[PDB]
């Protein structure tokens, strides 16, 4: 069953931006309803935990700028696994998240902190979301080769040979 | 999807249907001497205008020589005076007993709202027609008058030349 | 970065050769056939080298992660960013291999091994045929 | 309730003004290949006269369909140039629409 | 007239082929410019130089996806498919030429 | 520009067409 690749997949939510608008405060809230947000990530678990509790270079800059991002670490350091964190922000139109997974290897002999490993690239441009360059290059080259093949077969069709002259047109 | 699908009846009408439409409508008119869709060719027949002359869309309804206003003027003047007086009384309320200030605020707004109503009956398309009327009228009068001015000055120059050549004879 | 640098220089020379063959085809008069053959063969073998080198360094290209510059403004150059971002193939090639697969259309595996044995048999047969007659 | 064919055809005509909609529609092969769609486009031409023209919301599509009318004898090819050409020719086309209506 | 038509067709075809190929160079020229400015300056087009100061492409690391039977076997059998295709058009083109 | 005001655009709104009854009419085209 034909599936559109998620790298080119682009979601638009006019109702959400009309109701709430685009801001770093609710950029994760905007991302929550997208298909790219896995329901198995610990961010959703933290979300239900918060809901239950209520019912009952630029990395350091964005680190020190917002306190909710602080709360994100102090709620995310306890849970290791696939997590969604912000990468960088330039207002009022550009935001990009950092898709990384954490394995808090607390074993004896490792003086390093929890291991952070990239998984995917996500770019929020306007109200749209974008998600390999190797594929782009090979696709461009192969389409170029197809066009070249068509041109060369047409040119060879145009070619006419005679023994007494050689090849002419 | 983002783009809604084309209407369904669009695909029913081929070139053969278009060329057989005249005989089809002739037969339909002969037989006739919400429209039920008994044949695929019914849609090309122009749709009838609704008897109520109304159209509903998105929750909203839709449907001669240009082809006591003093009462409204004095009502507007007295309403403006009363609005200024009520503004003074409301700011005095804010001064002495602001706790109930809102009790007058919306009241003043009602008068302002009434002002908007007083604009609705005064609505201006005819006035725009008038102003455009005089601007092109005066422009064409200016063009005309400069035309007879220039032709008259040319004629005067010709007569002066004729007199000059007659004197040289 | 070294692998992408080599890819850059080789693709740049390939684009230069493409510009060349372009501005010698754009002339109203067609040059001699032989010059066209030389240009074709050179550019086409250069494309082969491009493919081979891109094959060699897939790991370095894959490991790299794309990210826009902090200094690069997206508000004014969003069109330029989207131009390079998009990667979907041209449609005509798409329905091209769709019709190709339509025409082509444990059983598949044993046909695959039957193709293996036909390939090996044909290779051995032509080796024998070449050995039959002295070509030196 | 179910809307009448008046409403859906009017909404289709007014949505034809969108450049994104036109680009998407022309992107698919079978939409332009099928004569049914162009037959419907020529059928839609009769809305340029009153009182039908009084019921329109955006007059720009009035030319666009007419421009789309030209597309049947100009070729698909030119789909790529559509946004650039509409952006460039918006001024004079708006001026001619104003001349057709405002005068 | 058919010669003119086919010449125009092959011109526009090669132009379409090269338009996509240019963007590959435009992307790949950024890394050296980021690493070494002076060498990288000449690589980009003047318009791209005007667009931004070039430091665009920086090295980064991502792990390789864990392998399994799922995708290589299908990748290679489908490559078998396209090369059987290429063999078919090879035979057809050779037959027409002969 | 940043405040999306309803029912006043130069061009027809995509959200207006999404909220328009033509969407469900196409969805309910079988019922037609």
């Amino acid at each position: 069953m034909n599936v559109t690749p998620l790298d080119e997949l682009q979601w638009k939510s006019p109702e959400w931006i009309q109701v709430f608008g685009l801001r770093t405060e609710n950029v994760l809230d905007y991302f929550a309803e997208s298909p790219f947000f896995d329901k198995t990530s610990n961010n959703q678990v933290i979300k239900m935990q918060r809901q239950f509790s209520q019912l009952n270079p630029a990395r350091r800059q964005i680190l020190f700028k917002y306190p909710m991002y602080m709360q994100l670490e102090e709620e995310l350091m306890k849970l290791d696994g696939t997590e969604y964190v912000l990468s960088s922000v330039r207002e009022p139109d550009f935001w990009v998240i950092r898709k990384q997974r954490r394995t808090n290897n607390s074993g004896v002999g490792s003086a390093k902190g929890p291991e952070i490993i990239p998984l995917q690239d996500y770019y929020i441009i306007g109200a749209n979301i974008y998600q390999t360059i190797f594929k782009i290059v090979q696709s461009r080259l192969m389409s170029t080769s197809y066009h070249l093949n068509s041109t060369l077969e047409s040119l060879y069709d145009l070619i006419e040979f005679q023994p007494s002259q050689g090849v002419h047109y | 999807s983002l783009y809604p699908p084309p209407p369904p009846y669009v695909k029913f009408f081929t070139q053969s249907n278009l060329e057989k439409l005249p005989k089809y409508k002739e037969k339909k008119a002969a037989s006739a001497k919400e429209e039920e869709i008994t044949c695929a060719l019914d849609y090309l027949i122009p749709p009838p205008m609704p008897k109520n002359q109304q159209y509903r869309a998105f929750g909203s309804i839709w449907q001669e020589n240009e082809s006591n206003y003093q009462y409204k003027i004095q009502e507007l003047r007295k309403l403006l005076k009363s609005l200024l007086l009520n503004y003074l009384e409301l700011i005095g309320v804010l001064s002495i007993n602001p706790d109930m200030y809102e009790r007058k605020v919306e009241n003043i707004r009602t008068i302002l709202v009434n002002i908007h109503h007083l604009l609705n009956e005064y609505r201006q398309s005819r006035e725009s027609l008038i102003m455009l009327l005089e601007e092109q009228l005066e422009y064409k009068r200016g063009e005309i008058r400069e035309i007879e001015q220039v032709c008259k000055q040319v004629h005067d120059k010709l007569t002066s030349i004729q007199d000059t050549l007659r004197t040289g004879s | 970065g070294q692998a992408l640098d080599a890819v850059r220089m080789r693709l740049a020379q390939l684009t230069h050769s493409l510009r060349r063959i372009r501005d010698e085809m754009s002339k109203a008069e067609l040059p001699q056939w032989y010059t066209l053959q030389s240009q074709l063969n050179v550019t086409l073998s250069q494309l082969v080298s491009v493919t081979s080198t891109l094959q060699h360094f897939q790991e370095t290209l894959d490991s790299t992660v794309v990210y826009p510059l902090p200094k690069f403004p997206t508000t004014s150059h969003e069109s330029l960013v989207t131009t390079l971002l998009r990667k979907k193939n041209i449609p005509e090639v798409d329905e091209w291999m769709k019709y190709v697969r339509e025409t082509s259309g444990e059983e598949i595996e044993k046909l695959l091994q039957q193709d293996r044995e036909i390939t090996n048999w044909a290779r051995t047969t032509f080796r024998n045929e070449y050995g039959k007659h002295d070509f030196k | 309730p179910l809307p009448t064919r008046f409403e859906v055809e009017l909404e289709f005509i007014q949505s034809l003004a969108n450049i994104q909609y036109v680009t998407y529609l022309l992107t698919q092969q079978q939409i332009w290949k099928s004569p049914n769609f162009k037959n419907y486009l020529k059928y839609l031409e009769y809305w340029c006269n009153p009182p039908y023209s009084q019921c329109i919301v955006y007059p720009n599509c009035l030319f666009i369909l007419k421009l789309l009318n030209g597309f049947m004898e100009s070729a698909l090819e030119g789909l790529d140039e559509l946004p650039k050409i509409i952006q460039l020719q918006g001024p004079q086309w708006m001026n001619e629409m104003v001349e057709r209506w405002a005068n | 007239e058919q010669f003119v038509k086919r010449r125009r067709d092959m011109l526009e075809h090669i132009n379409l082929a090269m338009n996509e190929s240019s963007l590959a160079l435009e992307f790949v020229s950024l890394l050296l410019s980021s690493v070494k400015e002076s060498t990288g300056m000449s690589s980009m087009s003047p318009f791209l130089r005007k667009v931004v100061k070039p430091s665009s492409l920086n090295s980064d690391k991502i792990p390789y996806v864990a392998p399994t039977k799922k995708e290589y076997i299908e990748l290679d059998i489908l490559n078998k498919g396209w090369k059987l295709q290429s063999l078919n058009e090879s035979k057809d083109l050779l037959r027409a030429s002969f | 520009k940043g405040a999306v005001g309803p029912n006043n655009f130069i061009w027809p709104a995509e959200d207006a067409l999404r909220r328009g009854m033509l969407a469900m009419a196409s969805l309910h085209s079988k019922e037609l």
């Binding site: 997949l9 682009q10 | 999807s1 | 684009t15 131009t83 | 559509l82 650039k84 | 338009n19 087009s45 | -």
Partner: peptide
């Protein structure tokens, strides 16, 4: 040095083929 730089071969007129589909909520 560098014999000749490459001519700008940008194609902004290219319409692109981005698939758009997950717009409905």
């Amino acid at each position: 040095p560098s014999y000749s730089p490459t001519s700008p071969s940008y194609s902004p007129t290219s319409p692109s083929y981005s698939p758009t589909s997950p717009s409905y909520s």
